[PDB]
């Protein structure tokens, strides 16, 4: 069983819907971090400073390769609003996974 | 090169930092992140109203040390109570030190 | 498809974004993160000192990966310790949320 990390950067107000849709599908362990994209600029002692940012959330969930397609579609179809900046979803390969409490590995750790 | 990522209870953070230093492992970075533990309805929409604070720690380590870094994090983050989190490894295909331009193992 | 990640000093952020933008590279996201700089106990130790950094991530094709890495390395460099690191990880699937485009079409 091959592990995969699904990462998505989406608009913040889609978070709860994304959570609920993944829970409904038996997918748990989602974590979320606040992040930013860029929208003008100002100068101060030799550096440029953006004064305008777009708030996003980065969500991550770990699942088996067999669920990956389903999970990606759930996130995409739930995060979409039709406006620019709806975000991206990408997959990365996980070579080893350990559940801290039990020491379980692989599928036993999902 | 390998990236070790772990999401653990916040209060284990500097025990983990100390344990990795003792094993000669440095370069850790930490970001605050949230898990989920309840939901509220407001105008036909659902809003998560309950989050669990965690920290996301990342360390870049040679393949030779990857397994002991994983097991050091696991034993030090472990409380036995639920929510202890997870540790995982992803492959790094290129690594560069910004200041010197060194690449690969020279960049650790 | 490749993910470029960099931990850099926070005052380089908009310069790096400017440089990448001039090279036609878009989609950068940035997250505040912390490195370590003394300690007291409470029964666990507690570090009272952290060094602020910014994590930047940009997704690019294999073809541009080396250009992007050098732009970030060159723009983020100050010459003083703590300048950070840049690393590349493989992306196996990429989807643009608004359209459903995949792969190269999702950049």
Numbering used by the authors:
A (entry chain A): -1 to 37, 42 to 112
B (entry chain B): 1 to 37, 42 to 112
C (entry chain C): 1 to 37, 42 to 46, 48 to 112
Original authors' sentences:
PII proteins are ubiquitous signaling proteins that are involved in the regulation of the nitrogen/carbon balance in bacteria, archaea, and some plants and algae. In the present study, crystal structures of the PII protein GlnK from Corynebacterium glutamicum have been determined, namely of adenylylated GlnK (adGlnK) and unmodified unadenylylated GlnK (unGlnK). The allosteric signal that links effector binding to the regulation of the activity of PII-interacting proteins is primarily transduced via the T-loop, which adopts different conformations depending on the nature and combination of bound effectors.
The protein crystallized in the tetragonal space group P43212 and the final model contains one GlnK trimer per asymmetric unit. Hence, and as is the case for other PII proteins, GlnK from C. glutamicum can be considered to be a permanent homotrimeric protein. All three phosphates bind highly similarly and interact exclusively with residues from the B- and C-loops. The phosphates form a direct hydrogen bond to the backbone of Gly87 from the B-loop, as well as additional hydrogen bonds to the side chains of Arg101 and Arg103, which either precede or are part of the C-loop.
